[PDB]
């Protein structure tokens, strides 16, 4: 129908500096730096108030206006991770074979790796390399819990999902074999 104007708003907290190039978005704050490229969507970024980012499209369709809603949440997610961060808590359960989980930090390539051993008695080791920017720690607070924390929700949630998919039973009965590692809590560090 070619709507003439459509706009949305991203509020910015006082401890942040948001810098936008052509469509490259950089958010700085207490916890670190996040960048992501938005050249695949036609959008006009602007400044409306002291702490408000204005994003507009002109002469777009219903599809192009709706693509403004995904970029508003994506930038707002970068605001949250830079301020408060993200935390995924994962529990691993077993019936007879205890699951040994080992987390080391690689000096080269600068990323954590999680090694899963003894999954329903299997002798294969399962190595999962994490995304750059997510730290994994063994919970010395409850039994059989890992914490995946970081600034990027994309990096934390994908690395958590990689662990689930690497410990998955095959050629068995789902109703009886309940062994696996599962995401228990999702939220913020602060």
């Amino acid at each position: 129908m070619r709507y003439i104007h459509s706009e949305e708003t991203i509020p910015v907290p006082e401890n942040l500096k948001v810098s936008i190039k052509s469509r490259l978005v950089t958010v700085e704050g207490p916890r670190g730096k996040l960048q992501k490229d938005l050249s695949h969507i036609a959008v006009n970024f602007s400044v409306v108030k002291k702490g408000v980012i204005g994003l507009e499209i002109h002469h777009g369709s219903r599809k192009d206006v709706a693509a403004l809603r995904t970029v508003r949440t994506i930038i707002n997610n970068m605001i949250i991770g830079v301020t408060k961060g993200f935390k995924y808590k994962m529990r691993y359960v077993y019936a007879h074979f205890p699951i040994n989980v080992n987390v080391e930090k690689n000096a080269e390539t600068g990323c954590y790796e999680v090694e899963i051993r003894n999954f329903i008695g299997e002798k294969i080791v399962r190595k999962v390399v994490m995304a750059p920017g997510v730290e994994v720690e063994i919970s010395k607070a409850q039994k059989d819990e890992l914490i995946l924390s970081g600034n990027s929700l994309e990096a934390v949630s994908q690395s958590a999902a990689d662990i689930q998919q690497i410990c998955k039973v095959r050629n068995k009965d789902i109703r009886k074999f309940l062994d696996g590692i599962y995401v228990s809590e999702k939220g913020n560090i602060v």
């Binding site: 529990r91 359960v93 607070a141 409850q142 039994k143 819990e145 228990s184 809590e185």
Partner: protein, 245 residues
């Protein structure tokens, strides 16, 4: 056009009321106005309002109304040209939020004396501050979460176990029995579902209700009343502390 969410039709016996319920509430208040002497206005701000049935039964002398605030505003009459008695428009000025009406014939002082004397303990409701720090113990969890001593308690149902994990406790089943860490104990610390001086999230309120831990008091605060014979309204310590519109 297309790409739309499909509404689910409900194969069930009760349907939306709509216009007929609104005019029925208009008519029922309309015949109630001449029959009684005093119209008391009250608020239950952030209560669960399940004990209003009890104040209905033991106060069979009076007629009690609790519905849409806008509908009771016009039923009494917001404008002074459209009103069924003098001073009703000032009674509509107290109708702001979760506000009810009390059509009574007895003494105004007797109603205030009774509503101050009534007190019931109820569940927390979201957005409240927490008066206590409550904690489920480390080992086997129970029906009340440790409020009653465990020797007089009953173990919690295994049906509740997926719900407790969803609401945030790391709870597992050993030998058909719902427990937090190990069945014997230790191997963890207890789970704190609320802390003192913390606003209660709805997740925490659902956890306190499930163990039947009560942290809030159900009370009815009278804003004011209007006398049919006299014709004006009066306020008592609750109209000052709450915004009116």
């Amino acid at each position: 056009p297309k790409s739309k969410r499909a509404r689910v039709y409900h194969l069930i016996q009760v349907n939306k009321k709509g216009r007929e319920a609104k005019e029925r509430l208009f008519s029922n208040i309309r015949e109630t106005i001449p029959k009684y002497q005093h119209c008391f206005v009250f608020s239950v701000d952030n209560m669960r309002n399940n004990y209003l049935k009890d104040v209905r039964h033991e106060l069979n002398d009076c007629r009690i109304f609790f519905g849409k605030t806008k509908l009771m505003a016009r039923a009494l009459g917001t404008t002074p040209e459209e009103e069924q008695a003098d001073g009703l428009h000032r009674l509509t000025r107290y109708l702001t939020g979760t506000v009810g009406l009390l059509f009574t014939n007895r003494d105004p002082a007797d109603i205030e004396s009774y509503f101050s004397n009534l007190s019931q303990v109820d569940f927390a409701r979201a957005g409240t501050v927490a008066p206590r720090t409550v904690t489920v113990p480390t080992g086997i969890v129970y029906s009340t979460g440790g409020e009653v001593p465990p020797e007089h308690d009953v173990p919690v149902s295994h049906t509740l176990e997926p719900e407790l994990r969803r609401l945030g406790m790391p709870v597992r089943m050993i030998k058909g029995k719902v427990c937090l860490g190990d069945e014997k104990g230790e191997a963890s610390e207890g789970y704190t579902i609320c802390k003192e001086g913390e606003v209660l999230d709805s997740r925490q309120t659902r956890l306190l209700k499930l163990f039947s831990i009560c942290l809030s008091e159900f009370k009815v605060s009278l804003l004011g009343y209007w006398n049919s014979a006299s014709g004006e309204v009066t306020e008592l310590e609750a109209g000052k502390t709450r915004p009116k519109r």
